Design an enzyme around this catalytic site. Structure first.
Site, PDB file in Angstrom:
ATOM      1  N   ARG A  19      -0.011  -6.991   7.764  1.00 31.03           N
ATOM      2  CA  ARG A  19      -0.718  -5.845   7.210  1.00 31.03           C
ATOM      3  C   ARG A  19      -0.721  -5.917   5.687  1.00 31.03           C
ATOM      4  NH1 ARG A  19       3.151  -1.240  10.096  1.00 31.03           N
ATOM      5  NH2 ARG A  19       5.103  -2.446  10.032  1.00 31.03           N
ATOM      6  N   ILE A  20      -1.876  -5.619   5.101  1.00 36.94           N
ATOM      7  CA  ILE A  20      -2.110  -5.814   3.675  1.00 36.94           C
ATOM      8  C   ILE A  20      -1.630  -4.584   2.916  1.00 36.94           C
ATOM      9  CG2 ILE A  20      -3.836  -6.249   1.900  1.00 36.94           C
ATOM     10  CD1 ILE A  20      -5.544  -7.575   4.129  1.00 36.94           C
ATOM     11  N   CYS A  21      -0.733  -4.799   1.955  1.00 36.71           N
ATOM     12  CA  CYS A  21      -0.149  -3.717   1.166  1.00 36.71           C
ATOM     13  C   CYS A  21      -0.855  -3.626  -0.188  1.00 36.71           C
ATOM     14  CB  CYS A  21       1.351  -3.941   1.000  1.00 36.71           C
ATOM     15  SG  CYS A  21       2.246  -4.152   2.559  1.00 36.71           S
ATOM     16  N   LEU A  22      -2.089  -3.124  -0.145  1.00 36.82           N
ATOM     17  CA  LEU A  22      -2.907  -2.933  -1.335  1.00 36.82           C
ATOM     18  C   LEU A  22      -3.272  -1.462  -1.481  1.00 36.82           C
ATOM     19  N   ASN A  61       2.854  -9.029  -1.021  1.00 36.62           N
ATOM     20  CA  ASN A  61       2.105  -7.868  -0.562  1.00 36.62           C
ATOM     21  C   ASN A  61       1.704  -7.964   0.905  1.00 36.62           C
TER      22      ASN A  61
END
Lengths: 73, 139, 136
Positions: free
Chosen positions: B79-82, B73
């Site tokens: 960059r955080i893919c949440l 993620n």
């Protein structure tokens, strides 16, 4: 998927493509939809002029990514 | 000045730190926040930057990973893919919830990118993840 | 905050924001400092530059966007403010860099450079053969 193509004037057009097709084939899809021949097509993406050899996967092109179509006068 | 909601949240993050998370605002910019946070990520410290856009609390906070992590993620740029920050954000959530949700991802890497090989080859791929946490997060 | 702005400028470069006459993006997709960018401009109509593609290398320092970035052409070009020997842009010669504001961005610099290619001085000026790149 769907990609965009913006021209020198400002017109933006949508186009269906796959993440595994080559730019040579992508340059053809823009032809069948807009008539511009792959000869005078120069596709730009994020400060990079695309090379007919590579593929979209090599350029990390995803959905909603916009191409810039620049033609030769 | 700065909106009251931000002031209230800052005093709670100061007067009640989250377990295992250090989060402090930059002396120059109050909306900028320096953030430090079993699993192969045990031991290595991970720095993070958190920002509050002018649209906050309407818009979700901006959070990325300054440190490099091998994680499905997290892309090459950190960059955080949440979903909590993508399109599932609501004004009810706060900085506290974002931080807690991020540390949750650290505990449960969800392969549901590199994830193609990280989920299929769970043994050969995780061998590299444990290393990155020592090479790139030495101190 | 430097990092988060460059992240917005990255996404804008991927969505091709603007009038389609300029483009920008990371020089290396794995660069986590977001320092080195590549730009491209297409010449404006009614000028000797028109339809010539120009590539540029752009460097955003640690104090970006507080301070302006470094800009240089890689494709040869004859234009006031651009070093005729290596294509480096003199910030004193470009108002957008001489009087830089933290609201500006890479897009703005490219747009400003293209607009200036229409100025009286640059409108008519002998250009080197298209496609040449400085010795680097």
């Amino acid at each position: 998927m769907q990609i965009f193509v913006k021209t020198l004037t400002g017109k933006t057009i949508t186009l269906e493509v796959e993440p595994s097709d080559t730019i040579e084939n992508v340059k053809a899809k823009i032809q069948d939809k807009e008539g511009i021949p792959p000869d005078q097509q120069r596709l730009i993406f994020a400060g990079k002029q695309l090379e007919d050899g590579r593929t979209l996967s090599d350029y990390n092109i995803h959905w909603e990514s916009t191409l810039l179509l620049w033609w030769r006068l | 000045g700065l909106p009251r909601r931000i002031i209230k949240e800052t005093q709670r993050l100061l007067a009640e730190p989250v377990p295992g998370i250090k989060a402090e605002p930059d002396e120059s910019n109050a909306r900028y926040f320096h953030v430090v946070i079993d699993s192969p990520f045990e031991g290595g410290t991970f720095k993070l930057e958190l920002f509050l856009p002018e649209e906050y609390p309407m818009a979700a906070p901006k959070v990325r990973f300054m440190t490099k992590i091998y994680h499905p993620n997290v892309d090459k740029l950190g960059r955080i893919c949440l979903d909590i920050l993508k399109d599932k954000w609501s004004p009810a959530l706060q900085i506290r919830t974002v931080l807690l949700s991020i540390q949750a991802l650290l505990s449960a890497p969800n392969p549901d990118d590199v994830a193609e090989q990280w989920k299929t080859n769970e043994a050969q791929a995780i061998e590299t993840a444990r290393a990155w946490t020592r090479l790139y997060a030495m101190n | 905050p430097r990092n988060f702005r460059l992240l917005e400028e990255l996404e804008e470069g991927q969505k091709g924001v603007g009038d389609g006459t300029v483009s920008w993006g990371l020089e290396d997709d794995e660069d986590m400092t977001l320092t080195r960018w590549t730009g491209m401009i297409i010449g404006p109509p009614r000028t000797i530059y028109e339809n010539r593609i120009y590539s540029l290398k752009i460097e955003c320092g640690p104090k970006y966007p507080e301070a302006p970035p470094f800009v240089r052409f890689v494709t040869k070009i004859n234009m006031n403010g651009v070093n005729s020997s290596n294509g480096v842009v003199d910030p004193r010669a470009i108002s957008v860099l001489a009087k830089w504001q933290n609201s500006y961005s890479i897009k703005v610099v490219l747009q400003e450079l293209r607009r200036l290619m229409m100025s009286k001085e640059n409108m008519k000026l002998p250009q080197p053969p298209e496609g040449q790149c400085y010795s680097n």
